[PDB]
Structure 1
């Protein structure tokens, strides 16, 4: 079967970084007979920035598709994306299989460079191909390059299996290879690699018989495998892919980062999100992992807003940044206090301060950021991304201009989640285990444990 002539990249969360966009543009330009698609999730993305990103991509002749619009976002994937700090590596690992099942084509990470164009037609004996190359290494297994024909049954089986693997992620034991991975790499990386990444893929290919008894996790031995599953039907290094020695991969998913806009949501919105997420965990696995949710919800970073003018309705205890009316104008930052009153924040002079204390000044570094903006009337998606990042973490030395971020503590939140979930008789009955270390709650968990 022929590999469908589409090259798929995924970027969920905030807007794809400029470096990755450049990588995608190079793929698109070197492979003009292929449709290049970037996949996004409009449900968690910041709307204005995504709209500007999409327009940019259209101007460049890159298609942008939304995972929900196209129907490739399984409820399991929605579950991870709606977390306050999603694991975008897990998300992408799952989306790539669903996308390929639906459309066919070639999935590629945005941290792989194009060394040579693909053939005009790629023909796959079993409708599915992997690369023996990944991240600068030959004779290896990875999930960052995957080719299939639309509707391929191997890819469909992998998509179904990865859902099951993901659903069972709390049950992941760090034994065998993953014992040591946990130790060196951290639980987050080890778990990601084993539940949705190349460790998952290894085990699944072994179970399906695609990899035989000679293949091991640390030594895939493609030269002893059925090479009809490989691009070009060979273990030889493909012509198509390149990375620099000094950056074999980005590891962009490793940091745990709040998804866009969490700091601007109400407590009630965030609480209801946690409840819905907990309900899914309970219905699918019977596990109520209370502390995960309470520990996300306890985080309140600065609320903020970038506008053209002062609104009717302001958010108490927030930053309000006002764009210049003309490219030569000045920006105005206000701290909106807890009584919804505007407090003009003074942005310090960028040129005239050579003292190390002034260089470190949060407000001077902010003004310098604003000063680098190309057209302040019409900031780009990436400029808005960086301004928004600065405002989330802006902590002035002046207390009068510092957000308060008064918020419930972890344990109080956990108590509220406990009550909300267990007061639903249906969910309460579906709980098999609850993980909490909160002293007020460990006993409420025992008392339910025995009720059953």
Structure 2
């Protein structure tokens, strides 16, 4: 019937794609010259300088980089997860892949799948929709599609709804098992947006038959026209010998002000209340209590200077020197970078962060023009840098969780529209349980 559009889609939102993953995508691009390799990104949550460097390098590698916001694929639902301080990138990619495929067609792939064999110049899908029989379980990390395919469009709408209701997801039945073997985050991702969600949809849609179970698909029993290559053989195209499962702060959170973070939380909660009636106060309070080091790497433009931060000045010429400062009250105190070349160190200085930090700086190819990955690594070091010298330690004075919760409560419940839409508030904080009770009584008398 239809043909899979000649596009290969890869998604990496948040920080820059690791170089290992860039190499895999490059191979897919070289081995499949007839196909346009595209890496999808989100400019709203990405480090701008590093992203610009990446887009240029990808242009040199023959890889198209597209933004989800500019192409109209980021539904407000995906934007709600990406604007979270620690986003579940797995749920985001599981949702963006369906919207991207539905708008451009082509093949979605995970950057960990390697190309062993080039794809056919034309791939035909009797239903405009193909999956791989790899994994047993259902693989959602290889998906082929013709632009606008109805199945993909239905999945895209259904995943949105699943996500909206994610807070009512229970680890029951097949998920009860999986909670204990893989973890909570992982198991919930699979039920809400991943293969679990997908299985139920493909069952509901009749694409999978009576016999298939979530952990025993039985592809050999199914309609083979839904499978790449029209059979249950392992396709030649793919090969595989983690990232999204640990919750990491999205970029620059350490460099936002308390008030800006409060403001972001208030917007997200409003979304939650308006879509679900649920006020997950402690989720927000426990994100917002975390304050890692503020930091800036001095670029051509002059730096906005946060009190209590690190400022790193790159060198003028390649054989110039890096300089680091602890900014205290906009006063700049210069931390002594330990010499790493003369060696001649004492055993004390082996564990020293500053020495290890200097070593990292010395390994920059071009100190005047560092790569995105070099910038990324230095950033990462700065976020966690903790000298033995207490005088050069970032202080990171920050409100505790319960105070933050109190502030979020005041702001949300002072809005009469939101206040009246709240059905259920989650908080374990003793000072806030009676305020939640009071609102419950208020609602009870109307």
Q: Bin the TM-score by the shorter chain.
A: over 0.9
Match among 197, 202, 220 for residue 200 of structure 1: 197
Contact 1:307/1:323 (8 A) holds in 2? yes
Contact 2:224/2:230 (8 A) holds in 1? yes
Contact 2:312/2:322 (8 A) holds in 1? yes
Q: CA deviation at 1:178?
A: 1.0
TM-score (norm 2): 0.97
How far apart are the structure 1 equivalents of 2:62 and 2:337? Answer: 43
Q: What is the aligned partner in structure 2 of residue 248 from structure 1?
A: none
Deviations 1:209-235 (A, max 9, x none): 111111001110000111111001111
Q: CA deviation at 1:195?
A: 0.6
Structure-2 change in CA distance of 1:312 and 1:52 (3 Å):
closer
Structure-2 change in CA distance of 1:441 and 1:124 (3 Å):
same
Q: CA deviation at 1:350?
A: 4.6
How far apart are the structure 2 equivalents of 1:427 and 1:259? Answer: 27
Structure-2 change in CA distance of 1:308 and 1:125 (3 Å):
closer
Contact 1:345/1:401 (8 A) holds in 2? no
How far apart are the structure 2 equivalents of 1:56 and 1:313? Answer: 28
How far apart are the structure 2 equivalents of 1:307 and 1:67? Answer: 29
Q: What is the aligned partner in structure 2 of residue 426 from structure 1?
A: 417
Structure-2 change in CA distance of 1:439 and 1:155 (3 Å):
same
Q: CA deviation at 1:255?
A: 1.3
Structure-2 change in CA distance of 1:319 and 1:442 (3 Å):
same
Q: What is the aligned partner in structure 2 of residue 62 from structure 1?
A: 63
How far apart are the structure 2 equivalents of 1:234 and 1:353? Answer: 65
How far apart are the structure 2 equivalents of 1:310 and 1:304? Answer: 15
Q: What is the aligned partner in structure 2 of residue 116 from structure 1?
A: 117
Could you say what secondary structure the match of 1:180 adopts? helix
Q: What is the aligned partner in structure 1 of residue 330 from structure 2?
A: 339
Contact 1:140/1:222 (8 A) holds in 2? no
Structure-2 change in CA distance of 1:401 and 1:309 (3 Å):
farther
Deviations 1:93-139 (A, max 9, x none): 100000000000000000000010100000101100000015xxxx6
Contact 1:275/1:421 (8 A) holds in 2? yes
Could you say what secondary structure the match of 1:345 adopts? coil
Contact 2:337/2:358 (8 A) holds in 1? no
Q: CA deviation at 1:187?
A: 1.2
Contact 1:15/1:49 (8 A) holds in 2? yes
Structure-2 change in CA distance of 1:214 and 1:355 (3 Å):
farther
Deviations 1:27-85 (A, max 9, x none): 00000000100000000000000000000000111000000000000000000000000
Structure-2 change in CA distance of 1:223 and 1:331 (3 Å):
same
How far apart are the structure 1 equivalents of 2:143 and 2:3? Answer: 14
Structure-2 change in CA distance of 1:144 and 1:355 (3 Å):
farther
Match among 273, 285, 295 for residue 294 of structure 1: 285
Q: CA deviation at 1:344?
A: 3.8
Contact 1:324/1:330 (8 A) holds in 2? yes
Q: What is the aligned partner in structure 1 of residue 214 from structure 2?
A: 217
Q: CA deviation at 1:314?
A: 2.2
| Aligned-residue CA RMSD (Å) | 1.4
Q: What is the aligned partner in structure 2 of residue 151 from structure 1?
A: 148
Contact 1:315/1:340 (8 A) holds in 2? no
Q: CA deviation at 1:347?
A: 3.3
Q: CA deviation at 1:353?
A: 4.9
Q: CA deviation at 1:332?
A: 0.3
Q: What is the aligned partner in structure 1 of residue 105 from structure 2?
A: 104
How far apart are the structure 2 equivalents of 1:417 and 1:308? Answer: 35
In the alignment, structure 2 segments of 5+ residues that lack a partner are: none
What count of residue pairs does the alignment treat as equivalent? 442
How far apart are the structure 2 equivalents of 1:14 and 1:313? Answer: 21
Could you say what secondary structure the match of 2:125 adopts? coil
Q: CA deviation at 1:326?
A: 0.6
How far apart are the structure 2 equivalents of 1:48 and 1:308? Answer: 9
How far apart are the structure 2 equivalents of 1:41 and 1:443? Answer: 40
Q: CA deviation at 1:446?
A: 1.4
How far apart are the structure 1 equivalents of 2:113 and 2:342? Answer: 40
How far apart are the structure 2 equivalents of 1:405 and 1:140? Answer: 45
Could you say what secondary structure the match of 2:312 adopts? strand
Q: CA deviation at 1:354?
A: 5.5
